[PDB]
Write a protein that binds this ligand. Structure first.
Ligand SMILES: CCCCCCCCCCCCCCCCCC(=O)OC[C@H](CO[C@@H]1O[C@H](CO[C@H]2O[C@H](CO)[C@H](O)[C@H](O)[C@H]2O)[C@H](O)[C@H](O)[C@H]1O)OC(=O)CCCCCCCCCCCCCCCCC
Ligand code: CLA
Ligand code: CLA
Ligand code: CLA
Ligand code: CLA
Ligand code: CLA
Ligand code: CLA
Ligand code: CLA
Ligand SMILES: CC1=C(/C=C/C(C)=C/C=C/C(C)=C/C=C/C=C(C)/C=C/C=C(C)/C=C/C2=C(C)CCCC2(C)C)C(C)(C)CCC1
Ligand SMILES: CC1=C(/C=C/C(C)=C/C=C/C(C)=C/C=C/C=C(C)/C=C/C=C(C)/C=C/C2=C(C)CCCC2(C)C)C(C)(C)CCC1
Ligand SMILES: CCCCCCCCCCCCO[C@H]1O[C@H](CO)[C@@H](O[C@H]2O[C@H](CO)[C@@H](O)[C@H](O)[C@H]2O)[C@H](O)[C@H]1O
Lengths: 80, 158, 733, 196, 68, 94
């Protein structure tokens, strides 16, 4: 399964959560930014590794990172 | 002479090549009427060929065993016309072009949207900067002396 | 440890065919295996090196056995200029009778292959004379190959495993390998030359049953002990000596003649003996420099810590490099591969101009094969050096412990380095291609006198300095009254000058404008390949587009389509790009060598001198003209002995092209296609009773790059080898 | 300001009270004092050898015994025998000359560097100042200056000797002076500087 | 060259070249960028087709005019 | 010319140079050059075969001259002796 991590430069814009095609990420309360929220990745066994979340992030450098790992049926997107 | 080469004005292979080319042209010339346009064009080509061989002979070039001119670029003062003087001309012209380009880029960078002046040239401004390439070697040298040509490494960044 | 591969749980749980492929590809990457420690890495490496030695010995023994069993070495010994040596017999049940007739050659009683490796000349020069000697050599090598396996097995048992600190004793290893592996081996080979091969070159047969009684020299070791060493040189061989016989033979064993043997056209044996003796001395002295256990010897760390320029322009100098090198095996592999590649090229350059084996200079096909073979091997080694150097920066480099030394400052001025390499490549490409195109246009319009032809004056001047008289320069060894000419006038100058001024051999060939142009093309190739590899190595840890690259490892597919797109961003991809340019450069080198020599051997140098200045000359007079025999190996009217080569030629063109498929089309096209075939199989009667156990998927991105480059390289090599061998042997044998 | 170049600023690390300091150090090789002291000692050592060597190059040539270059030719002849004032040297054999020189000079120069006093390193006393002249420090420093000046002037002369020998092979120092005095306006450095 | 490679390498190289231009005050305001992935594929296929077709064109025309 | 004299003289001179001329410099430069790996010597790091031999290094000579030093300077003596003994009959070598 792939690994997904969130770093504390997040501004809580929620774009990565909206971009994910298999519902890996979600927003949770926080106090470190003006939006009072931060992203989280509790369901990485369903991650396919597409990196749309990285494409959506506006900070420099990124606040969400994806490291590809061992492959499974779910992570290879096999319907057979 | 130099490197076992022979001057082209004394080379038998050079004269043989000239004669062969002239004969090949004359064979074609003998197919048309004397006053027709193709005949005049071929005759002009023949005269041009003879002039080219004569000038190569009397300009001091060296010819190899193949009978073709060879160039000397080691610094020998009998052949500066082959590489060194045209090289000085190339450097002068290239420096002019580069200097006027850099000066335009520096003069235009102070505006609100400099990029708009890079896809649409301000000809009024460029026509005042183009003539100044005439003395680029002096301007570049003085700029180098005063420390205006180069940016310090600490200041380089996007 | 669940299933194959036992060394990777991540691969072992993969349910697709990707488990198998990758299992094969990561077998020898010990550092990445599960639960590996530092000590086991060294121990397993030691065992594997013993395995490589065993395989090498088996390969050589097989060559000896097959030559002895099925060759014509004894027949070749008596007529070496008109007999073709035999590699091995052919037994192919697919053959037809005309092929059986065509491949029967060399005086054999059946179809055979002709050998181009040159082992006949080599084994004849070192004193072998009969098939019994070859059989004994093969059996001895078979014994050594078994010894290697037994030692590898023994040093892998708990009683006999070396500790980690044993493998890191640099001074002791350097002493043992310099003194013993290089120097003493040279001493033993010099002894062989004095006791066996040189006597064999005079009609004397010394073997294991009588070598004690016969004396290598009439006066024995007396002159050596007393110091009257000049007695070992005073009666050299005559200029009318016949190599295998006593007619004109001498008695010297150590000389300083220079030049060649007039009959064999190779180097004198006594010169080779004195050479190996002096080299052995130099290595024996070199091997006493470092400190092991006796209170004397230098320390490498203390040597490195001292050489620091006091002006501060090199930062902290070489401080900290000892641990950086000694704790990283990739750094060591990079240094070793670089050195070996350089000397492989040096071997190739020096073996064509100064032959050392009797009657090999006249065997044109063998010489061509050896030069080409060793240049391609050298190119592959050179690329590997930079690959493992790049791996060092990612896996082992520690910034904190290298603060402000030379290695860190290299990373500090990478933009300047890369930009100046780019400028050099641009300059060379623009002006070299421009000159070639100008000459082509002048030829097309029928005015060859308007070409730009630059005489290679500097190289001609150096040749004149080395003794050549062609160009009329009077400098150093080409002058008659000078200190350099006087100093060596009586030692080796006569033979050397006789060799250099003979225009039949390949010692300092005459050069012209075509040589100038092709040399600047070769320089372009070197500079561009270096640019690609260096940019790969120095950007391995990160750049502006990907500032955290080191977290992702040496080889990974990409970083996705964001930020403009990031295809081919890893260091592995830089290696992949550089291999193409390496093949291009080595191709230019070998094309130039082959055409110049093929016009030399036909006595038609003017052909090269006139056609080489424009590119249509290369296309028409080298490639097109020299294929005519090769493509007629078989035709509608019959076949001849070149047929196999003709077949191989086409085989090459095929594999090359197949590689294009993997390089141009990428994965997402193929995966979608594969899904449909899976659907089709699961739905077909009488065939859905059979089920797969590994789910089929398309190949990975990196895997596809690898497979495509492999097909490209194999096709490249096979095509050129077929052309080279067929073109040369069709004309000369 | 700098005494060597009037109107030029003095270097930061210079302007000290050194025997021969004129503020000349364009490359700044003397930034570290520990290097500066050893450079002073090395300067004294080069100066003394050059001063001692100048008469050894000028006297035999002026006595008609061969210039300083041809005196080394007999060592290149296998049967060459040394001569001194026209008297052959019995032990002129090359091996013993090359052996005893190394053996004696190694010890003689190994002894001198065991000293640890930096000030006494340049100027020792004892058996090297028999008459004695350090009684007055002011005149001592004056003599030090008048020694370093002549030493620099002697090093310049030796380099001139080497270059003039290279320009005219087979000739000697005083021969060039004689040639210059013969035709001052025609025999100068101009021919070599502008070569034909 | 366009068909076998990818754009990340070329953008990384352009960064080094841009450093040198910045050194001498000649960095353009229109920031240089490597070709997009699609443009790389398009340029590749266009030059492949042009080269192959033109090679065959010259071959045919010279052959048929000279021998016919 | 006579090997039994040349070799003895060369060995004697080399031994004299070793024992009385360059002794201090060698014995003070040696103390500052000890091979080590990661801040520890080879024997301290675990290599049991890297122990420095103690029996052969002790001596009753006043300055510590030992057998290893004997061999080190004797080798130079023989090499130089045979260098001079070779460029006498006929040798044009460096
Ligand atoms: C005869 C044929 C003999 C061979 C037949 C089989 C060939 C099969 C090849 C499949 C390659 C698959 C691949 O994609 O394999 C990928 C591998 C390695 O990828 C690895 O992939 C790994 C994947 O992870 C997996 O593995 C990891 C390590 O075990 C972990 O366990 C992890 O949990 C697990 O998921 C990791 O990412 C590693 O970091 C990564 O390096 O790449 C590599 O092998 C690349 C390095 C190999 C050498 C490259 C240079 C040499 C070739 C140049 C051209 C040659 C021309 C020859 C001419 C001859 C002319 C006569
Ligand atoms: C490394 C290669 C190299 C280099 C850098 C040079 C450099 C030079 N050579 Mg050349 N030269 C070389 C190799 C080289 N040479 C070799 C190998 C030979 C022997 C064949 C020669 C033979 C040679 C001759 C015969 C002469 C030179 C001269 C010169 C000078 C011409 C410069 C000049 O006036 O420009 C003009 C630029 C401007 C006006 C601006 C220059 C210093 C010439 C000279 O006068 O040298 C002092 C000269 O006469 N060279
Ligand atoms: C004197 C003692 C000695 C000797 C002879 C060796 C020998 C060897 N050691 Mg070493 N080793 C020693 C002591 C010694 N070791 C000690 C004391 C230690 C502990 C500190 C080690 C620790 C050690 C390790 C850890 C390893 C070795 C390895 C090796 C092998 C290297 C591979 C090889 O065969 O290269 C052969 C090399 C040469 C013959 C010399 C290079 C010649 C070049 C290429 C020029 C050739 C020129 C010539 C004219 C060409 C002729 C060509 C021909 C076709 C005509 C080799 C057998 C490696 C190995 O493979 O072990 C199994 C290895 O991994 N050793
Ligand atoms: C002394 C030589 C030496 C040694 C000991 C090693 C050792 C290692 N290398 Mg290095 N390497 C070398 C030379 C060497 N290399 C050279 C010369 C090159 C340049 C080509 C490289 C380039 C290189 C790369 C690019 C990489 C390594 C890597 C590796 C690791 C092994 C990977 C593996 O298991 O592959 C398993 C082997 C295979 C899958 C087989 C591949 C065979 C290729 C595709 C061609 C086969 C074609 C075949 C012969 C066709 C025949 C057709 C027929 C009709 C004739 C290991 C640390 C890897 C590493 O460390 O990554 C972190 C890695 O990525 N090496
Ligand atoms: C024949 C094929 C070919 C050619 C000509 C080039 C050319 C180039 N490559 Mg490429 N390359 C190729 C194949 C080729 N490559 C292949 C197969 C690969 C493997 C994937 C690569 C991989 C590769 C890499 C990885 C790199 C290069 C680099 C380079 C440059 C080297 C420096 C140079 O010569 O600059 C001189 C430039 C040229 C010779 C290009 C042609 C210039 C023309 C003739 C100028 C005139 C144009 C004309 C007037 C326009 C008319 C058209 C229109 C307006 C009507 C250059 C632009 C390196 C680079 O970028 O260095 C800076 C580099 O890093 N190449
Ligand atoms: C080798 C002899 C030598 C040495 C070691 C020194 C050393 C010193 N000199 Mg002295 N000097 C010398 C020769 C030497 N000098 C000569 C020949 C002259 C007359 C021209 C002078 C004139 C002179 C003056 C006027 C002054 C010094 C001073 C100094 C001190 C500071 C400069 C320095 O760091 O030099 C270190 C020098 C070196 C490390 C040598 C570098 C040599 C380079 C690598 C090559 C040089 C090649 C040469 C230029 C070729 C052309 C020679 C030709 C013109 C004759 C230092 C103690 C200054 C001071 O304060 O003294 C107390 C000072 O004021 N020197
Ligand atoms: C820097 C010191 C120095 C050195 C190394 C030499 C070296 C030499 N001198 Mg010179 N010489 C020097 C200073 C030096 N000289 C001085 C200061 C003077 C003036 C008093 C002379 C006066 C002088 C004369 C008059 C002669 C030499 C000669 C010689 C040569 C033979 C020496 C010999 O055989 O000695 C053997 C051992 C002893 C004398 C004891 C030799 C090249 C001779 C020469 O070149 O003859 C051709 C010679 O005739 N020298
Ligand atoms: C034990 C090895 C050995 C032996 C038996 C010989 C024997 C010979 N050499 Mg060889 N030689 C050797 C090593 C050896 N050499 C080495 C290591 C080198 C490299 C420096 C040379 C370099 C060399 C040259 C340049 C010449 C000879 C010559 C000779 C011949 C005349 C005697 C002489 O001058 O010797 C040479 C004596 C030495 C090199 C002394 C070495 C001193 C130490 C050990 C190393 C250097 C410090 C004789 C056949 C001469 C000749 O005419 O041959 C036909 C000749 O001109 N040799
Ligand atoms: C990246 C990297 C790496 C790699 C590297 C490399 C790969 C390199 C290479 C390099 C090279 C590849 C080099 C080469 C060089 C060479 C040279 C430098 C040469 C020289 C020569 C000479 C000097 C000579 C001389 C002479 C002559 C010519 C004649 C006779 C005499 C004499 C001998 C004098 C490493 C591993 C480190 C790691 C880190 C990173
Ligand atoms: C004083 C004294 C003493 C004495 C001592 C002695 C007497 C010593 C000696 C010593 C010695 C006496 C030593 C020696 C050594 C030697 C050596 C160490 C050698 C080596 C050699 C070699 C190594 C060789 C080689 C070779 C060969 C083999 C061949 C040919 C070549 C050559 C020569 C190179 C005593 C004890 C009583 C005590 C008191 C004091
Ligand atoms: C051309 C060649 C001619 C050679 C002629 C012969 C020269 C012989 C010189 C021998 C000098 C021996 O040196 C002898 O006096 C030195 C000066 O007092 C002593 O040296 C001692 O005194 C110095 C001066 O106070 C101080 O640096 C130290 O205390 C110490 O080095 C030596 O310990 C002694 O051995």
């Amino acid at each position: 399964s792939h690994s997904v991590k969130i770093y504390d430069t997040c501004i809580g814009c929620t774009q990565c959560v909206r971009a994910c095609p298999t519902d890996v990420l979600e927003m949770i309360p926080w106090d470190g930014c003006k939006a009072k929220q931060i992203a989280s990745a509790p369901r990485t066994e369903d991650c396919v590794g597409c990196k749309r979340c990285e494409s959506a992030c506006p900070t420099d450098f990124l606040s969400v990172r994806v490291y590809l790992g061992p492959e499974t049926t779910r992570s290879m997107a096999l319907s057979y | 002479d130099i490197a076992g080469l022979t001057p082209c004005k004394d080379s038998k292979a050079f004269a043989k090549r000239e004669k062969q080319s002239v004969k090949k042209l004359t064979s074609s010339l003998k197919k048309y009427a004397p006053d027709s346009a193709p005949a005049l064009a071929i005759q002009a080509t023949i005269d041009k060929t003879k002039r080219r061989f004569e000038n190569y002979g009397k300009f001091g070039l060296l010819c190899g065993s193949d009978g073709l001119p060879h160039l000397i670029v080691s610094g020998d003062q009998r052949h500066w016309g082959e590489f060194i003087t045209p090289g000085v001309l190339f450097l002068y012209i290239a420096g002019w072009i580069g200097w006027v380009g850099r000066s335009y880029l520096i003069a235009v960078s102070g505006e609100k949207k400099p990029a708009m002046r890079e896809i649409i040239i301000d000809v009024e401004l460029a026509s005042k900067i183009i003539p100044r390439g005439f003395i680029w070697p002096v301007a570049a040298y003085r700029e180098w002396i005063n420390g205006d040509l180069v940016v310090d490494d600490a200041d380089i960044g996007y | 440890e669940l299933r194959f591969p036992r060394f990777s749980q991540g691969l072992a749980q993969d349910p697709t065919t990707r488990r198998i492929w990758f299992g094969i590809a990561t077998a020898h990457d010990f550092e990445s295996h599960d639960d590996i420690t530092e000590e086991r890495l060294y121990q397993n490496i030691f065992a594997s090196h013993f395995g490589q030695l065993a395989i090498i010995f088996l390969w050589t023994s097989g060559n000896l056995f097959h030559v002895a069993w099925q060759g014509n070495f004894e027949s070749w010994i008596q007529d070496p200029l008109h007999v073709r040596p035999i590699a091995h017999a052919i037994w192919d049940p697919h053959f037809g009778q005309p092929a059986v007739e065509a491949f029967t050659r060399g005086g054999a009683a059946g179809p055979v292959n002709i050998a181009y490796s040159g082992v006949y000349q080599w084994w004849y020069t070192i004193g072998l004379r009969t098939n019994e000697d070859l059989y004994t050599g093969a059996l001895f090598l078979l014994f050594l190959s078994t010894l290697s396996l037994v030692a590898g097995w023994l040093h892998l048992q708990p009683k006999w495993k070396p500790s980690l600190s044993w493998f890191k004793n640099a001074e002791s290893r350097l002493n043992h390998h310099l003194s013993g592996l290089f120097g003493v081996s040279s001493l033993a080979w010099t002894g062989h030359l004095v006791h066996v091969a040189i006597p064999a070159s005079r009609g004397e047969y010394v073997r294991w049953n009588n070598f004690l009684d016969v004396l290598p020299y009439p006066q024995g070791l007396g002159p050596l002990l007393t110091g009257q060493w000049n007695l070992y040189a005073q009666n050299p061989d005559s200029s009318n000596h016949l190599f295998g016989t006593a007619q004109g033979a001498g008695t010297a064993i150590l000389t300083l003649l220079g030049g060649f043997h007039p009959q064999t056209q190779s180097l004198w044996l006594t010169d080779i003996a004195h050479h190996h003796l002096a080299i052995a001395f130099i290595f024996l002295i070199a091997g006493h420099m470092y400190r092991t256990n006796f209170g004397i010897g230098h320390s490498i760390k203390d040597l490195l810590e001292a050489h620091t320029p006091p002006g501060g322009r090199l930062g902290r100098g070489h401080k900290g490099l000892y641990d950086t090198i000694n704790n990283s095996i990739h750094f060591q592999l990079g240094l070793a591969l670089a050195s070996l590649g350089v000397i492989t090229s040096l071997v190739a350059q020096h073996m064509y101009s100064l032959p050392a084996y009797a009657f090999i200079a006249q065997d044109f096909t063998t010489q061509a094969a050896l030069y080409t073979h060793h240049q391609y091997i050298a190119g592959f080694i050179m690329t590997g050096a930079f690959a493992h150097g790049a791996i060092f920066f990612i896996r082992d480099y520690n910034p904190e412990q290298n603060e402000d030394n030379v290695l860190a400052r290299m990373l500090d001025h990478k933009e300047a380095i890369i930009s100046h390499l780019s400028w050099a490549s641009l300059f060379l490409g623009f002006h070299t291609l421009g000159l070639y195109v100008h000459n082509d246009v002048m030829l097309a319009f029928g005015t060859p006198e308007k070409q730009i032809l630059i005489e290679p004056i500097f190289a001609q001047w150096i040749q004149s300095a080395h003794g050549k008289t062609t160009y009329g320069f009077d400098i150093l060894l080409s002058s008659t009254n000078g200190p350099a000419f006087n100093a060596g006038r009586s030692l080796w100058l006569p033979g050397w000058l006789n060799a250099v001024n003979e225009n039949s051999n390949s010692l300092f060939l005459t050069i012209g404008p075509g040589d100038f142009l092709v040399h600047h093309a070769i320089a372009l190739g070197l500079h561009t390949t270096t640019l690609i590899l260096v940019k790969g190595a120095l950007d391995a840890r990160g750049s502006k587009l990907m500032p955290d690259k080191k977290d992702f490892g040496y080889s990974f597919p990409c970083d996705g389509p964001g930020r403009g797109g990031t295809c081919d961003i890893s260091a592995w991809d830089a290696f992949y790009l550089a291999v193409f340019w390496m093949l291009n450069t080595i191709g230019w080198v070998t094309f130039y060598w082959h055409w110049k020599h093929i016009t030399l051997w036909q006595g038609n140098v003017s052909q090269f001198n006139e056609s080489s200045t424009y590119l249509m000359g290369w296309l028409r007079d080298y490639l097109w003209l020299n294929s005519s025999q090769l493509i007629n190996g078989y035709n509608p009217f019959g076949m001849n002995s070149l047929s196999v080569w003709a077949w191989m030629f086409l085989f090459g063109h095929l594999v090359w092209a197949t590689g294009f498929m993997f390089l141009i089309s990428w994965r997402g096209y193929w995966q979608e296609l594969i899904e449909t075939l899976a659907w089709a199989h699961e739905r077909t009667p009488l065939a859905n009773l059979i089920r797969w156990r590994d789910k089929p998927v398309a190949l990975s991105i990196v895997q596809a790059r690898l497979v495509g480059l492999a097909h490209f390289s194999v096709g490249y090599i096979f095509t050129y080898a077929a052309f080279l061998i067929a073109s040369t042997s069709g004309k000369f044998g | 300001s700098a005494e060597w170049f009037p109107g030029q600023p003095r270097p930061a690390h210079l302007d000290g009270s050194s025997p021969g300091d004129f503020g000349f150090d364009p490359l700044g090789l003397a930034t570290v004092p520990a290097n500066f002291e050893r450079f002073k000692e090395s300067e004294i050592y080069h100066c003394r050898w050059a001063m001692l060597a100048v008469p050894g190059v000028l006297l035999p040539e002026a006595l008609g015994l061969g210039n300083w270059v041809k005196a080394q030719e007999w060592a290149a002849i296998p049967g060459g025998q040394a001569t001194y004032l026209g008297n052959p040297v019995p032990w002129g054999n090359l091996p013993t000359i090359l052996a005893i020189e190394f053996l004696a000079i190694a010890f003689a120069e190994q002894q001198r560097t065991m000293e640890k006093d930096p000030e006494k390193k340049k100027y020792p006393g004892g058996a090297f100042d028999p008459l004695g002249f350090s009684k007055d420090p002011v005149k001592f420093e004056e003599l030090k200056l008048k020694e370093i000046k002549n030493g620099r002037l002697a090093m310049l002369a030796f380099v001139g000797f080497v270059v003039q020998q290279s320009a005219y092979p087979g000739t000697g120092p005083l021969e060039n002076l004689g040639s210059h005095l013969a035709d001052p306006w025609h025999n100068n450095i101009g021919d070599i500087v502008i070569p034909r | 060259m366009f068909l076998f490679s990818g754009r990340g390498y070329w953008q990384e190289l352009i960064e080094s070249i841009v450093w040198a231009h910045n050194k001498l005050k000649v960095a353009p305001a229109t920031q240089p960028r490597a070709l997009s992935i699609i443009q790389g594929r398009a340029v590749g296929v266009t030059h492949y087709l042009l080269g192959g077709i033109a090679t065959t064109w010259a071959f045919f025309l010279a052959r048929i005019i000279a021998v016919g | 010319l006579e090997p039994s004299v040349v070799i003895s003289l060369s060995t004697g001179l080399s031994l004299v140079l070793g024992r009385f001329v360059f002794f201090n410099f060698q014995r003070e430069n040696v103390a500052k050059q000890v091979p080590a790996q990661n801040g520890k010597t080879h024997f301290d790091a675990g290599d049991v075969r890297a122990k420095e031999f103690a029996g052969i290094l002790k001596s009753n000579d006043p300055v510590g001259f030992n057998i290893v030093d004997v061999l080190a300077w004797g080798s130079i003596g023989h090499i130089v002796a045979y260098y001079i003994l070779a460029t006498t009959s006929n040798g044009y070598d460096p």
